[PDB]
């Protein structure tokens, strides 16, 4: 049910198996591997919870503002364990409006970023790395995800989107043995947090993490982490594939094999089949199977995942007449635009809706993408107006099998033909 319960369980069944490994390239250029077993991770989160239990009361908000790393991980988890509403942010190096919007009772940080945090703040400041982390009811809301508006994320939303997210990676729903999550995505973003911290905990599998800055410094690192003993699965924005393909030289791959990769989800935004294909091509040389790269669609309002392309094969593309499409109708060519074929998910439910009338669009007609599912946030933190406009969509004269609402109005344009979903943007 709960994330801290999921962790509490992992420490029970596989106490001494590696859980999280953070690759630190800050000092060593080849990177130092910092690891915590499930029971070691669970102990630190409890010690963090103890400290937090001395600040405010249940339901209060605790901001996490520290660099990417294991301190960040235990801070987030510790906040949940204490029954506090976590607020994952980055280290402020003028979004000073978030601290004012959530009224946190505490800020969890580290010695490395403390001075930078105070230059932007009275909530209690706790430096997690200075606590004795290894020393031997609750709100439905787990945390706020700031896009700015703060998305209210409940434990249920996370649970559910995780189950859905697992049909995206392995439609067979669990990861085969010896598999591991690899990620450099910032923890303060929806997919870096859900895919990098929550999923491995709820799934009971190991995660190998690093920082976005280390990735920028030497993109090849992302490839290196995916070329090892375990079968890796990762995720990244569309731009990372281009960057990784161009800045990883053939020498960087010396002795590396990519044939063990499971799946690489391609960003929930601005995905291009061109960028993907070009990534597969440059790395085919090192045994990278093009079918492991799969496009995913989503937004924070729906936790993170909404749908992907057919598994077990590369992403199918379909050409549509550009002019007709711009006029609102998907027709076969003869100007041509190529769009990825996303599979209409069973959960959550998706519908193409005319944004002016709130009436469904027939297949082939362009409209706004509406989403219905337990993974949809109930709203924005203390923003009744925005919440209503965004999450209170109601379909008019719904067709059989279609719920009347509530619906999440994504703000994206798309259409459906042959049971397939296509996103325009």
| Dist CA 55 CA 399 (whole Å) | 50
For 174-185, letters b (16+ CB in 10 Å) and e give ebeeebbbbbbb
- CATH code for the domain of 140: 3.40.50.12780
Q: In what order do the strands lie in the sheet with 367-372?
A: 342-343, 420-423, 408-417, 367-372, 349-354, 359-360
Q: Within 13 Å and on the Cβ side, how many CA atoms surround 414?
A: 25
How far is CA 308 from each of CA 108, 126, 170, 345, 351, rounded to the nearest angstrom? 35, 40, 11, 8, 15
Number of domains in the chain: 1
Residue 156 has which token pair?
């249920």
- Number of C-beta neighbours around residue 128 at 10 A: 24
Half-sphere exposure of 313 (CA within 13 A, CB side): 9
Q: What CA–CA distance (Å, rounded) separates 71 from 47?
A: 12
On whether the CB atoms of residues 126 and 106 are closer than 8 A, the answer is yes
Long-range contacts of 26-33 (CB under 8 A, 24+ apart): 26/214, 31/210, 31/214, 31/221
Give CA–CA dist 365/393, Å, rounded: 19
The residues pairing with 408 across neighbouring beta strands, listed in sequence order, are: 371
* Nearest Cα to Cα of residue 220 among 196, 192, 251, 189: 251
What are the respective helix, strand and coil percentages of the chain, to the nearest 5? 30, 25, 40
CA–CA dist 50, 108 (Å, integer): 13
Phi, psi (degrees; rounded to nearest 5) at 345 = -70, 155
C-beta neighbour count of 229 within 10 angstroms: 8
Write out the residue range of the structural domain in which residue 231 sits. Answer: 1-425
> Is the N-terminal amide bond of 283 cis, ω within 30° of 0?
no
Cα–Cα distance for residue pair 191/198, rounded to 1 Å? 10
For this entry, resolution in Å reads 2.3
């Amino acid at each position: 049910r709960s994330l801290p319960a999921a962790l509490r369980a992992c420490a029970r069944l596989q106490p001494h198996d590696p859980a999280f490994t953070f690759m630190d390239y800050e000092q060593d250029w080849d990177g130092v591997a910092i690891t915590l077993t499930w029971s070691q991770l669970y102990r630190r989160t409890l010690n963090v919870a103890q400290e937090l239990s001395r600040c405010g009361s249940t339901g209060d908000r605790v901001v996490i503002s520290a660099p990417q790393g294991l301190e960040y991980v235990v801070a987030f988890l510790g906040a949940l364990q204490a029954g506090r509403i976590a607020v994952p942010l980055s280290v402020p190096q003028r979004s000073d409006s978030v601290l004012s919007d959530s009224s946190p009772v505490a800020i969890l940080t580290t010695s490395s970023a403390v001075d930078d945090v105070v230059q932007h703040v009275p909530p209690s400041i706790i430096e997690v790395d200075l606590l004795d982390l290894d020393a031997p009811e609750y709100p439905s809301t787990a945390y706020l995800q700031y896009t700015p508006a703060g998305v209210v994320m409940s434990h249920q939303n996370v649970r559910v989107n995780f189950e859905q997210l697992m049909s995206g990676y392995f439609a067979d729903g669990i990861p085969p043995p010896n598999s591991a999550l690899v990620s450099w995505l910032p923890f303060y973003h929806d997919m870096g947090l859900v895919i990098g911290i929550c999923a491995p905990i709820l799934g009971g599998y190991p995660a190998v993490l690093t920082s976005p800055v280390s990735f920028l410094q030497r993109p090849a690192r992302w490839m290196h982490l995916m070329a090892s003993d375990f079968h890796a699965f990762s995720a990244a924005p569309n731009f990372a594939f281009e960057l990784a393909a161009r800045r990883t030289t053939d020498d960087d791959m010396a002795g590396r094999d990519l044939g063990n990769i499971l799946t690489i989800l391609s960003g929930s935004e601005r995905v291009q089949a061109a960028t993907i294909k070009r990534f597969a091509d440059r790395f085919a040389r090192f045994n990278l199977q093009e079918r492991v790269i799969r496009p995913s669609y989503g937004l924070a309002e729906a936790t993170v995942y909404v749908a992907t392309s057919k598994p077990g094969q590369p992403p199918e593309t379909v050409d549509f007449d550009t002019e007709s499409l711009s006029a609102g109708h998907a027709k076969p060519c003869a100007g041509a635009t190529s769009l990825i074929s996303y599979m209409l998910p069973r959960s959550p439910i998706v519908r193409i809706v005319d944004s002016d009338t709130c009436i469904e669009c027939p297949d082939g007609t362009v409209g706004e993408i509406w989403v219905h599912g337990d993974n949809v946030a109930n709203g924005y933190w203390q923003k009744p107006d925005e919440s209503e406009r965004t999450f209170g969509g109601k379909i008019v004269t719904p067709s059989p099998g279609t719920p009347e609402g509530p619906w999440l109005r994504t703000g994206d344009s798309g259409f459906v033909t042959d049971g397939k979903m296509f996103i325009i943007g």
